[PDB]
Design an enzyme around this catalytic site. Sequence first.
Site, short mmCIF file in Angstrom:
data_model
loop_
_atom_site.label_atom_id
_atom_site.label_comp_id
_atom_site.label_asym_id
_atom_site.label_seq_id
_atom_site.Cartn_x
_atom_site.Cartn_y
_atom_site.Cartn_z
N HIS A 11 -9.51 -5.18 0.49
CA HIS A 11 -8.58 -5.87 -0.49
C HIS A 11 -8.06 -7.10 0.09
O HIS A 11 -7.46 -7.88 -0.63
CB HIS A 11 -7.67 -5.07 -1.24
CG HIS A 11 -6.49 -4.43 -0.40
ND1 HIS A 11 -6.35 -3.45 0.09
CD2 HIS A 11 -5.24 -5.23 -0.43
CE1 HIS A 11 -4.99 -3.34 0.52
NE2 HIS A 11 -4.36 -4.36 0.25
N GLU B 243 0.58 -12.61 18.21
CA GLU B 243 1.97 -12.99 17.49
C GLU B 243 3.18 -12.24 17.60
O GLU B 243 3.06 -11.16 17.48
CB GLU B 243 1.70 -13.36 15.91
CG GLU B 243 0.62 -14.53 15.57
CD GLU B 243 1.56 -15.76 15.33
OE1 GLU B 243 1.18 -16.85 14.77
OE2 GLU B 243 2.70 -15.79 15.97
N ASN C 279 6.69 -13.74 16.22
CA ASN C 279 7.76 -14.55 15.09
C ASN C 279 6.35 -15.45 14.23
O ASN C 279 5.79 -16.10 14.92
CB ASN C 279 8.43 -15.46 15.85
CG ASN C 279 9.06 -16.24 14.48
OD1 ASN C 279 8.61 -16.60 13.40
ND2 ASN C 279 10.39 -16.56 14.56
N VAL D 72 6.98 -19.24 14.17
CA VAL D 72 7.43 -20.03 15.34
C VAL D 72 6.16 -20.10 16.32
O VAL D 72 5.75 -18.98 16.67
CB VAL D 72 8.70 -19.78 16.26
CG1 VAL D 72 8.85 -20.44 17.40
CG2 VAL D 72 9.76 -19.88 15.01
N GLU E 99 0.04 -17.04 21.22
CA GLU E 99 -0.76 -16.91 19.98
C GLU E 99 -2.02 -17.56 20.31
O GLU E 99 -2.60 -18.46 21.23
CB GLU E 99 -0.28 -18.01 18.79
CG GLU E 99 1.20 -17.41 18.41
CD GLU E 99 2.30 -17.98 18.95
OE1 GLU E 99 2.26 -18.61 20.23
OE2 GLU E 99 3.32 -18.05 18.37
N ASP F 251 -11.94 1.25 1.60
CA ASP F 251 -11.36 0.14 1.66
C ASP F 251 -11.06 -0.44 3.17
O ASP F 251 -10.11 -0.44 3.86
CB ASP F 251 -9.68 0.07 1.05
CG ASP F 251 -8.95 -1.10 1.09
OD1 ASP F 251 -9.58 -2.09 0.95
OD2 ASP F 251 -7.78 -0.98 0.80
N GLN G 70 3.60 -4.21 0.75
CA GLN G 70 2.78 -5.33 0.62
C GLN G 70 2.94 -6.17 1.50
O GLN G 70 4.06 -6.47 2.25
CB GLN G 70 3.50 -6.12 -0.63
CG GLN G 70 3.24 -7.62 -0.87
CD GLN G 70 3.66 -7.82 -2.29
OE1 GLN G 70 4.85 -8.14 -2.53
NE2 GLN G 70 2.88 -8.14 -3.31
N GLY G 71 1.80 -6.91 2.13
CA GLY G 71 1.95 -7.63 3.41
C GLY G 71 1.54 -7.00 4.58
O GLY G 71 0.97 -7.41 5.52
N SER H 172 -0.81 -4.53 4.07
CA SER H 172 -2.15 -4.26 3.85
C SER H 172 -3.26 -4.82 5.01
O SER H 172 -3.02 -5.88 5.64
CB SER H 172 -2.53 -4.94 2.74
OG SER H 172 -1.85 -4.19 1.68
N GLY H 173 -4.13 -3.94 5.24
CA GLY H 173 -5.04 -4.12 6.43
C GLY H 173 -4.63 -4.08 7.92
O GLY H 173 -5.45 -3.93 8.75
N1 801 Z 1 3.87 1.78 -0.37
C1 801 Z 1 2.77 1.38 0.64
N2 801 Z 1 2.57 2.24 1.64
C2 801 Z 1 1.89 0.25 0.32
C3 801 Z 1 1.19 -0.16 1.36
C4 801 Z 1 0.36 -1.48 1.27
C5 801 Z 1 0.48 -2.00 0.20
N3 801 Z 1 0.01 -3.19 -0.30
C6 801 Z 1 0.12 -3.46 -1.41
C7 801 Z 1 -0.03 -4.48 -2.15
N4 801 Z 1 0.78 -4.87 -3.26
C8 801 Z 1 0.35 -5.94 -3.70
C9 801 Z 1 -0.71 -6.97 -3.45
C10 801 Z 1 -1.33 -6.54 -2.38
C11 801 Z 1 -1.01 -5.27 -1.65
O1 801 Z 1 -1.61 -5.36 -0.58
N5 801 Z 1 0.98 -2.56 -1.86
C12 801 Z 1 1.17 -1.67 -0.94
C13 801 Z 1 1.83 -0.38 -1.04
CA CA Z 2 4.55 -17.30 16.39
#
Ligand code: 801
Ligand code: CA
Length: 223
Positions: free
Chosen positions: A40, A52, A54, A57, A62, A84, A174-175, A177-178
Amino acid sequence: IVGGYTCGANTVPYQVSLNSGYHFCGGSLINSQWVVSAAHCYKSGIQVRLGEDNINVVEGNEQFISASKSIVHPSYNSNTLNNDIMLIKLKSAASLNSRVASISLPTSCASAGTQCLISGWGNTKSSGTSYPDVLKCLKAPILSDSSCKSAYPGQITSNMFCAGYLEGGKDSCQGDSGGPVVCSGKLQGIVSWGSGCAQKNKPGVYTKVCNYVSWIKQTIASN
Ligand SMILES: NC(=[NH2+])c1ccc2[nH]c(-c3ncccc3[O-])nc2c1
Ligand SMILES: [Ca+2]
Ligand SMILES: [Cl-]
């Protein structure tokens, strides 16, 4: 990462940031020209950023390399997030040193109770958005399949596992992911989804990498 701590610069050398003008997903370096992330997180215009700490910066260490191609698993289902996983091939190979290093793929699946390290630059608040500048870490255990299926009935496939705390407070978000879920030096999971972040009885769900090692090996060997 919610309830985690500052990892410390370059202490997680296989962690990468996928960037398209801003950080949108994490990933793991598995050799000098290949990264593993979540299906995703797929988009075009991806620059992989290695070494990386920070992400806002340039502090040194990097390596910014463009992705030459991203291979989403052919059976990925965006509605169930089953399979996924995605592989990204880099335009040039990365210079590996002590600050940038790859992580090993597992030869066996991990068991419930295994303690793993999850890291990323994702959201740090369960209720609201605070995004950090530096890499955050969280040590979390793999939960049993019964508790995982009991938490998300009908949504867990055999290519998923839950890891985290049922009491709430510590979790990926969120953020993140991956990104990596490393247990005993081996990449066992990829941050995939969950309900909210750090909510009681709603642990994080991760892609179970031990089920894809031959798919990864065969795909890298042919591309
Ligand atoms: N509760 C968790 N362990 C979790 C982990 C990764 C996630 N990634 C996301 C996510 N949400 C909105 C947009 C993209 C995302 O990867 N929710 C997430 C929730
Ligand atoms: Ca940096
Ligand atoms: Cl079920």
